[PDB]
Amino acid sequence: KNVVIYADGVYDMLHLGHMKQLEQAKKLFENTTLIVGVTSDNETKLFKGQVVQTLEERTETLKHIRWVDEIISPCPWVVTPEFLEKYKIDYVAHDDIPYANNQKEDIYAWLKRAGKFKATQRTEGVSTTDLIVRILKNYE
Amino acid sequence: KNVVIYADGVYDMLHLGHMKQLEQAKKLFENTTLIVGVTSDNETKLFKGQVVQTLEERTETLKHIRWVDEIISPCPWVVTPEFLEKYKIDYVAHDDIPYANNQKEDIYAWLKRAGKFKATQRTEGVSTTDLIVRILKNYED
Ligand SMILES: C[N+](C)(C)CCOP(=O)([O-])OP(=O)(O)OC[C@H]1O[C@@H](n2ccc(N)nc2=O)[C@H](O)[C@@H]1O
Numbered sequence A: 001k002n003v004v005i006y007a008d009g010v011y012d013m014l015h016l017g018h019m020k021q022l023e024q025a026k027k028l029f030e031n032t033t034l035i036v037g038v039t040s041d042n043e044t045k046l047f048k049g050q051v052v053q054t055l056e057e058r059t060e061t062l063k064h065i066r067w068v069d070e071i072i073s074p075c076p077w078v079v080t081p082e083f084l085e086k087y088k089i090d091y092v093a094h095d096d097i098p099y100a101n102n103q104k105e106d107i108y109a110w111l112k113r114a115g116k117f118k119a120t121q122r123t124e125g126v127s128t129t130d131l132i133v134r135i136l137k138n139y140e
Numbered sequence B: 001k002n003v004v005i006y007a008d009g010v011y012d013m014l015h016l017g018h019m020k021q022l023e024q025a026k027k028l029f030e031n032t033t034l035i036v037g038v039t040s041d042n043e044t045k046l047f048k049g050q051v052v053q054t055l056e057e058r059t060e061t062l063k064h065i066r067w068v069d070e071i072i073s074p075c076p077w078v079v080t081p082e083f084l085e086k087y088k089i090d091y092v093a094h095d096d097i098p099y100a101n102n103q104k105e106d107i108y109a110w111l112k113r114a115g116k117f118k119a120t121q122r123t124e125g126v127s128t129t130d131l132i133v134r135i136l137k138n139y140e141d
């Protein structure tokens, strides 16, 4: 009854949305190991856009989060079944929103069809960027 | 054996500096209870300046940090002997820069004289605002 959970992400400018996500992942079953995958600077730039923080920084911050049991740094961009079998992963946690890879429309779709995906919910309006937006409007 | 450490703060827009301070506090001794105090919205505006996040949001964020054993929200601005009595605190953990208000040049002074203060180190250039400065200095994002 100990279920391995893999949640992957850039985890740039770690903020309460990520932390709450990691909490949902950890708490999907009574007993878990939560493995966090953090993407590389270079893949993140190729496929998404430039990263504010290096992989080292993004990895360091996540060590402070209560829910995290293990970290894979760097992690791959797309989840392969070789990868699930290597880290003994039972389910992959991430939001519902289809995640495009330029021509490939949802890199998580295979996992949903395979029965190996658990949806977590986004939290809105608490990003590191929304916080600065509040500062620039209390000025004004 | 078990030592009770009290770290107090605003803990606005929680960032790696804060987390590292808490980590240091927690690890001051082999066995500890880390109690974190989080200041009220109105006292923070009155004694320090704008607080971006409410008391509820600052409290919630700290819920997620590995080192935190207990939170006192809201906490008082100035530590008193009665407060250390109430929670059984051995040491208050904070950076060693004297912290002024209207009445005293260092609100930590009595604890420092009393052998009841543990200095933690600041970590510079990792704040939530410093991160947003790196986006803006290189708008290539
Ligand atoms: C690169 N991948 C495909 C391997 C995973 C990347 O995933 P991502 O770009 O959604 O990364 P991210 O760092 O933005 O999000 C990481 C995790 O944070 C969660 N998240 C993020 C922001 C937010 N406001 N609420 C959230 O719940 C996302 O749902 C995701 O589950």
Ligand SMILES: C[N+](C)(C)CCOP(=O)([O-])OP(=O)(O)OC[C@H]1O[C@@H](n2ccc(N)nc2=O)[C@H](O)[C@@H]1O
Pocket (backbone or CB within 6 Å): B008, B009, B010, B011, B012, B017, B018, B020, B021, B039, B048, B076, B077, B078, B093, B094, B095, B099, B107, B120, B121, B122, B123, B124, B125, B127
């Ligand atoms: C208001 N008090 C007097 C009740 C508590 C102290 O309030 P404060 O203004 O220092 O709060 P703060 O939130 O700015 O910082 C709280 C704690 O994080 C530490 N800190 C802060 C910023 C930073 N870059 N590194 C840190 O180590 C501070 O030294 C302090 O120990």
